[PDB]
Amino acid sequence: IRASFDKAEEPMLGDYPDIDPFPAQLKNPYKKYDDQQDRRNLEEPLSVNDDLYDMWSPDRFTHFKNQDALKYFIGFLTIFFGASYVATYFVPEKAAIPREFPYEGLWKESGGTEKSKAFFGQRS
Amino acid sequence: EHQRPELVSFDDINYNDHKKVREAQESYTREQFIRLEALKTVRKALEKCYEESGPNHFEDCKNLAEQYLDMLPTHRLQGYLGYQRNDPSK
Amino acid sequence: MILAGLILKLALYAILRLLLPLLCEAQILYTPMIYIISLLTIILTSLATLRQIDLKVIIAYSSISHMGIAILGVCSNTSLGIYGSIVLGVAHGFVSPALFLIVGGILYDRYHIRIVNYYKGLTTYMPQLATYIIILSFANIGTPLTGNFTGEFLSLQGGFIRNPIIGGISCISVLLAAIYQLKLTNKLTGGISSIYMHRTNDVTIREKFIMNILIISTLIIGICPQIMYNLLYWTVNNYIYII
Amino acid sequence: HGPELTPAVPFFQPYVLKWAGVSLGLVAFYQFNSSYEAKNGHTWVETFFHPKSRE
Amino acid sequence: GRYPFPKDVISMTGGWWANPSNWKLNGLFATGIAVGLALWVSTATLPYTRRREGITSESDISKWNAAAGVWRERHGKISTGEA
Amino acid sequence: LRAYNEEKELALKQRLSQLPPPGKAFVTAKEAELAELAEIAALYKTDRVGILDILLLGNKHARLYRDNTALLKDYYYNGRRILWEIKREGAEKEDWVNQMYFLYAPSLILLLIVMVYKSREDITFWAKKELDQRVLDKHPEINDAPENERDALIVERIIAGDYDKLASLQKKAT
Amino acid sequence: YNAISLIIILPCISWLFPLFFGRQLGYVFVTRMTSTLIIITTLITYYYFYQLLGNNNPINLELFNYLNIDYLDINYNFEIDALTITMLLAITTISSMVHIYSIGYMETDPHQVRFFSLLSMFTFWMIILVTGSNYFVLFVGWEFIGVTSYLLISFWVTRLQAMKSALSAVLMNRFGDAFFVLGLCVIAYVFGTLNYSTIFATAYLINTDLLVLIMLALFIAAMAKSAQFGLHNWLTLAMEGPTPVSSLLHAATLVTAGIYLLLRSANILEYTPTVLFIILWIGALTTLSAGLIAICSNDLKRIIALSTMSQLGMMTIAIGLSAYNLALFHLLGHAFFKALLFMSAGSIIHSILNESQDIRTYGGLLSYLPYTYICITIASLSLMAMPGLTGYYTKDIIIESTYGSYSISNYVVYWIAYLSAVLTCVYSMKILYLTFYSNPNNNTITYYNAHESNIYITLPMFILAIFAMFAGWILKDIYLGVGTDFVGTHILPNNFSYFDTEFSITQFYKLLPLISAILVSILIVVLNEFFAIVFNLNNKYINTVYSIFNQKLVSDQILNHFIIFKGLVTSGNIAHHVDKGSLYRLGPVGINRLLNKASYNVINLSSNTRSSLSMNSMLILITIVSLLLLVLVMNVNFIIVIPVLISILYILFS
Numbered sequence A: 001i002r003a004s005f006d007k008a009e010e011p012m013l014g015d016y017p018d019i020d021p022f023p024a025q026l027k028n029p030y031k032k033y034d035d036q037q038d039r040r041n042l043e044e045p046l047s048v049n050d051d052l053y054d055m056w057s058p059d060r061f062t063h064f065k066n067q068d069a070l071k072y073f074i075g076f077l078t079i080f081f082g083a084s085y086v087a088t089y090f091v092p093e094k095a096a097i098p099r100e101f102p103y104e105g106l107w108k109e110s111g112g113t114e115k116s117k118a119f120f121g122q123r124s
Numbered sequence B: 001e002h003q004r005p006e007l008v009s010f011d012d013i014n015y016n017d018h019k020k021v022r023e024a025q026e027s028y029t030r031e032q033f034i035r036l037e038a039l040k041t042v043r044k045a046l047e048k049c050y051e052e053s054g055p056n057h058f059e060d061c062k063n064l065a066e067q068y069l070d071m072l073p074t075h076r077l078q079g080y081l082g083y084q085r086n087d088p089s090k
Numbered sequence C: 001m002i003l004a005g006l007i008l009k010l011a012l013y014a015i016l017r018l019l020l021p022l023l024c025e026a027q028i029l030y031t032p033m034i035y036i037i038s039l040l041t042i043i044l045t046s047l048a049t050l051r052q053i054d055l056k057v058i059i060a061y062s063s064i065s066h067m068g069i070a071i072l073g074v075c076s077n078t079s080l081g082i083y084g085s086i087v088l089g090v091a092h093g094f095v096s097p098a099l100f101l102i103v104g105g106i107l108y109d110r111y112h113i114r115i116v117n118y119y120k121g122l123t124t125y126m127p128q129l130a131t132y133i134i135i136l137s138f139a140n141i142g143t144p145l146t147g148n149f150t151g152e153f154l155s156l157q158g159g160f161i162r163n164p165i166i167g168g169i170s171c172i173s174v175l176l177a178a179i180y181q182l183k184l185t186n187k188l189t190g191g192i193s194s195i196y197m198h199r200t201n202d203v204t205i206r207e208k209f210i211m212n213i214l215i216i217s218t219l220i221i222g223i224c225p226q227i228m229y230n231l232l233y234w235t236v237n238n239y240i241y242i243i
Numbered sequence D: 001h002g003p004e005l006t007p008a009v010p011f012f013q014p015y016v017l018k019w020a021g022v023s024l025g026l027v028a029f030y031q032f033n034s035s036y037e038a039k040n041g042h043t044w045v046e047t048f049f050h051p052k053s054r055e
Numbered sequence E: 001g002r003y004p005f006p007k008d009v010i011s012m013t014g015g016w017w018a019n020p021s022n023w024k025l026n027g028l029f030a031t032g033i034a035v036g037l038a039l040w041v042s043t044a045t046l047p048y049t050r051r052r053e054g055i056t057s058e059s060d061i062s063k064w065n066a067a068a069g070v071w072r073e074r075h076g077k078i079s080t081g082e083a
Numbered sequence F: 001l002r003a004y005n006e007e008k009e010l011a012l013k014q015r016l017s018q019l020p021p022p023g024k025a026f027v028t029a030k031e032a033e034l035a036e037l038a039e040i041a042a043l044y045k046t047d048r049v050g051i052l053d054i055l056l057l058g059n060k061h062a063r064l065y066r067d068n069t070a071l072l073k074d075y076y077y078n079g080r081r082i083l084w085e086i087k088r089e090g091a092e093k094e095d096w097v098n099q100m101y102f103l104y105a106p107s108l109i110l111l112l113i114v115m116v117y118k119s120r121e122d123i124t125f126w127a128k129k130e131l132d133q134r135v136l137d138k139h140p141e142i143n144d145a146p147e148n149e150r151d152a153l154i155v156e157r158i159i160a161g162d163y164d165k166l167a168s169l170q171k172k173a174t
Numbered sequence G: 001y002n003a004i005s006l007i008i009i010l011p012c013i014s015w016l017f018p019l020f021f022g023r024q025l026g027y028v029f030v031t032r033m034t035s036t037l038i039i040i041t042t043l044i045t046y047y048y049f050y051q052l053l054g055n056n057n058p059i060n061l062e063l064f065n066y067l068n069i070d071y072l073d074i075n076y077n078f079e080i081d082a083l084t085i086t087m088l089l090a091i092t093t094i095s096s097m098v099h100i101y102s103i104g105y106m107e108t109d110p111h112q113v114r115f116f117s118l119l120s121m122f123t124f125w126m127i128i129l130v131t132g133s134n135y136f137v138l139f140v141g142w143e144f145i146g147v148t149s150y151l152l153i154s155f156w157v158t159r160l161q162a163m164k165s166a167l168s169a170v171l172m173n174r175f176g177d178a179f180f181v182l183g184l185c186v187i188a189y190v191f192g193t194l195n196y197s198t199i200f201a202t203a204y205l206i207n208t209d210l211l212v213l214i215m216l217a218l219f220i221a222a223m224a225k226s227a228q229f230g231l232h233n234w235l236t237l238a239m240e241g242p243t244p245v246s247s248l249l250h251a252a253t254l255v256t257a258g259i260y261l262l263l264r265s266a267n268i269l270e271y272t273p274t275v276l277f278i279i280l281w282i283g284a285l286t287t288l289s290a291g292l293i294a295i296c297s298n299d300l301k302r303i304i305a306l307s308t309m310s311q312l313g314m315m316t317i318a319i320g321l322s323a324y325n326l327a328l329f330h331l332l333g334h335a336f337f338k339a340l341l342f343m344s345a346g347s348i349i350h351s352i353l354n355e356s357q358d359i360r361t362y363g364g365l366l367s368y369l370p371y372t373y374i375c376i377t378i379a380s381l382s383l384m385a386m387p388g389l390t391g392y393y394t395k396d397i398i399i400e401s402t403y404g405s406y407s408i409s410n411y412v413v414y415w416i417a418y419l420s421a422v423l424t425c426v427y428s429m430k431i432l433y434l435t436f437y438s439n440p441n442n443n444t445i446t447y448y449n450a451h452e453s454n455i456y457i458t459l460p461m462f463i464l465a466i467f468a469m470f471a472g473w474i475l476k477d478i479y480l481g482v483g484t485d486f487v488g489t490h491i492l493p494n495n496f497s498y499f500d501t502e503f504s505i506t507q508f509y510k511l512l513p514l515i516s517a518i519l520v521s522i523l524i525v526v527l528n529e530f531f532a533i534v535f536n537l538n539n540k541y542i543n544t545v546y547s548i549f550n551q552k553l554v555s556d557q558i559l560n561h562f563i564i565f566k567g568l569v570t571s572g573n574i575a576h577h578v579d580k581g582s583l584y585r586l587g588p589v590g591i592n593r594l595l596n597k598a599s600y601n602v603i604n605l606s607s608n609t610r611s612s613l614s615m616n617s618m619l620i621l622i623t624i625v626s627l628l629l630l631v632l633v634m635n636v637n638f639i640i641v642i643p644v645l646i647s648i649l650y651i652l653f654s
């Protein structure tokens, strides 16, 4: 009932007991269940939309809030590509010219025809 | 024994006899595989040009590379139903 | 088995035999409805597989997703897609009834209930069934050298010729067919052997004799898909209308 | 230091015999037919191929 | 560890700790089959190997470039670089 | 033309009529009652059928046989489940393995053999030779070349000439 | 003696025979069978490398046709290029050391017939990933190493987290496998061929707008498996497998295959400056991301896994700067770093009674374990590019080539790749201090029973130590060198900047990495030992930052909650709101209710009035009046009877 999809299934159930969905992972492990593997007593009512709250369900972290976590991830993505873009204005220039090649730019060596000399050839 | 059956066009074969129609279908088909083996032969020659040339493949067989990229849209299977169901200049 | 291996490939045969050679001009107007319907069976029905409590229903929707790949190889009006859909029809008809022997064949004979939630830890008491879980699943996903990938590859390529944006979107099916099949495979294969489950027999001589036939007959097509090009090379041409 | 030996097991179990026998039989059959390039000029099982002429 | 295991289940890769009593005998069969396989495959694939460079002559490649130029000349095909 | 016996086949039913049902005859978790059954269970295996004996008889013998085999079957397999009975050797041949290893599997191997050698006659293997013959028909002077030279002198014709004759089937086009 | 079929078929023997004859031979025989066949594979490939130094022509072999249709053939062609033999002597050497290392590390593992089958299998589909001579066999090995990466790290099927980590790993790789299939479908239509020899002959003619479409797909394929930032959370989620598995899957091989895709395609890579820019600025991001996470995570396997993904960023930077010799040389010497780092970490995990992995619970192990000390300090001084070792030859020159490139914006990636080297020192000092030099941290039994392992764990660390010291100076004239025509990569000469980056470097920019790497490596040890309050502050603000970089730069949470969990929720909005909800309303559920209502109304047409004669007799009148007015309404206008007939159906059926 916590999530917006669990709320959206209230009018379907008619005889279903409608229990509180709680993750199988955030139960403690030290209580001795029937199923130590999945943290579940033998006859325990499964939830509306169980397989998101299974042990085989996703990992479901519990340290940050997911909204905060979204802010911190996009914050690192912003602080990298903003700083690396601003730092292209503070770049120093090169001390050397680009090097050069003979034979009118090696136009003939990388393919080429006399009419076709524009597409092939570098730095005459 | 490598047999060579005859070529029959679709033009003027009277599509009411199933003998000449089916031979026209198979002939246009088999000539189309022949038309493809030229592509498969120039590809085999272009790779040997490349492997022997090494670094100067850019200028040794520019003609074979451009040759292969010229044949490639126009040497493939295309269907006898395109030319049988339609007539040009009508 | 006879439904999913034979009744489904019949309409793959009937779209070739009935439709394509007298509907030649009515299709090229109307193939981009076939691409709509085939894509949103691949996108939709291979995504509803994820949330399935029953174990035979998953392999059912797997059959839907591969038959939705296959009919965008037929309706390509190109030469690789026709042969790719035929090799899909001959290889899915091998790999899929083997999976129905795994789900309702062996496991329903032993425990008579087909809910997924009872079934974990199949390795510790049935090792030489968990092998047939894995190699037959990894044959269904479209790992190469199995004859499903030759068909998936050529049909996605033929559907990439005809319209490349629909082929680029439809290429995601390799992912979407891996997701549910490997999720099922690692739920069944791994974990502690279940509470609910007394240990029953190993997979018996007949339920190996079936399986190895349905596995070699995929692997031969996967190592050589050319063993049936001697039949099909006319029907690769008999259905193209690209003038 | 003893690796704690398990009961004795024969080598040529039935699947070894069946799978290796059929695989080596098919390989020997393939080489048997490829040995007829100069002896007859065509393969042996092609002599069993009798379709009708296309005409 | 050496926890106990059920001896009735028959795997193919061995089980938990497979150490059968005649493994010295079966090792001889395994090495015989492995050396037979390795030598037979290594001699069978000898004529299928070729050497990459130098398998065809230069004169062949120059005349294939010539025939390419003939076929290209007859269809009236500009160079890809020609605009 | 195998054999049977009639009077044995009647006396077997006379023996079975005094026996308990298959759902009782083995559910006693020895040799006072379990020793007669361990021979009767081998009467299932002993293979009295008749190749030509099924053809040349009437249904009065047939129904009697079929009821006797249908009871010997249960006395074999129920005693196999709970407990010749008291042995263990492998592997007791089944019912399907005669016509799946000796008719299904060799026809299914023969299908592979025919598919491999029918792939020799292919359109690529025929089209390559037809293209080489079309080269050697128009230009038969490259037959005068040595045998090693001809494989490079055909390819210069293939690369050189068109030699496809597809535009000659399309005479309505131009 | 073919020296290719002995390279290929011999680990195929090493896989197939442990499974077929596993129960018959047993684990004691499979330990020495599986190892020695990889040993002789390895000493055939050194000999072939020695011959290939003599002349530069490879041998290929040709096998049976896979499939040909129109414009397309696919064969089984295996060709051992220079680019192939580099990776080949990497993976055979690393693998053959791991097969020996896992004899003594697994001596109490039950199921080590399957485990040696699986190690030699992963060796084999690497062996055919590398040497195939089309993009198809490069797909074959690419998928079967993904299949093994399922079957390997989920070795303990009993453990839950290993099975979910296998799910994570293989589905991450499969994301890139989809884009590799997309790219390969573009390959076989632009070029018509999957062979390398045609594609590389004709790649200079196809324009940039298509090669962007190709190499975007073939870079997402490598970004998935060579673990760049877009998805990277399967490496660190692959440590539920054991340590000799990690000494393959992260030392060289599985990380290396994504680099190999971009090393093969280097002849189509040149003609796209569009993809090389994004290759640069993804590989530049991942050095920083992995260096910043590898500081703050205190688990021994996670340190070296994030080291691997901080250095594949350096290889990717070397790709994007059009310097492929640097990336291939780093790929080679990097295996001999990492495999020694992993099988040193496995030796100090295995040498504790608890077998723990937190670095916070090791303490002083210097006097107790000197052998693994001297091995892992070979490893760390190689890893930080110290002057004598292979790391100086293999890692600092990639930092050099950022300054020497012709694009002006690549001076930024100098400091972007430099920061990563300072950060590379600050965790290697963390792992050398907090498990060897510090005050003890465990209970004292683990200090009574601390010892070393027999010969199977000592000898591969010895050999990989020798290689990780010498092989960079020995092989620095084949990959680096100066005019070395050994690899056949064809750099565009308008993009070739290696002659520029050797000489235009001033003393400061070359001196500065070596120096500050050393100096920060002393500062971390001194600030750990003397002061130690700097690192143990209880700032509320610094520790939110530490908890960010501990939890993988939160992104595992991001990928899990915003994509996986939302993907499962919106797949439940199809299987229940569409597949079972609304397509049955137009199917067998809505039509059952429609026919139930309409049948009930036509049944109840004549319900009451048990005088059935009067009931049927007043009905015959209407049905010659309603028709008689209906036709009058019709032949004045047709349209005005259709709502009449719809309303008659409404009053009749409802």
Ligand SMILES: CCCCCCCCCCCCCCCCCC(=O)OC[C@H](COP(=O)(O)OCCN)OC(=O)CCCCCCCCCCCCCCCCC
Binding pocket: A056, A057, A058, A059, C043, C169, C172, C179, C183, G161, G164, G165, G167, G168, G171, G172, G175, G220, G230, G231, G237, G559, G560, G563, G564, G567, G568
């Ligand atoms: C722009 C550049 C693009 C480059 C990439 C950019 C970033 C993309 C990142 C997302 C892609 C990653 C691949 C998607 C598959 C994810 C699979 C997965 O992560 O499964 C893991 C999960 C269990 O893993 P876990 O519990 O975390 O393990 C903890 C171990 N201690 O196992 C599970 O149980 C999960 C089962 C569900 C799997 C996910 C289902 C949704 C998949 C989304 C695909 C979207 C397809 C939409 C198609 C629309 C097309 C129009």
Ligand SMILES: CCCCCCCCCCCC(=O)OC[C@H](COP(=O)(O)OCC[N+](C)(C)C)OC(=O)CCCCCCCCCCC
Binding pocket: C216, C219, C220, C223, C224, C227, E041, E044, E045, E048, F116, G009, G012, G062, G063, G064, G065
């Ligand atoms: C197991 C690890 C790999 C082992 C590799 C061993 C190589 C042995 C030598 C092979 C010689 C060869 O294949 O020859 C190839 C022959 C004929 O082709 P060709 O034109 O004459 O030569 C080709 C060289 N060209 C191109 C230069 C001309 O075709 C075949 O055989 C195909 C037979 C396939 C049978 C169906 C597949 C069955 C697989 C079932 C498995 C369960």
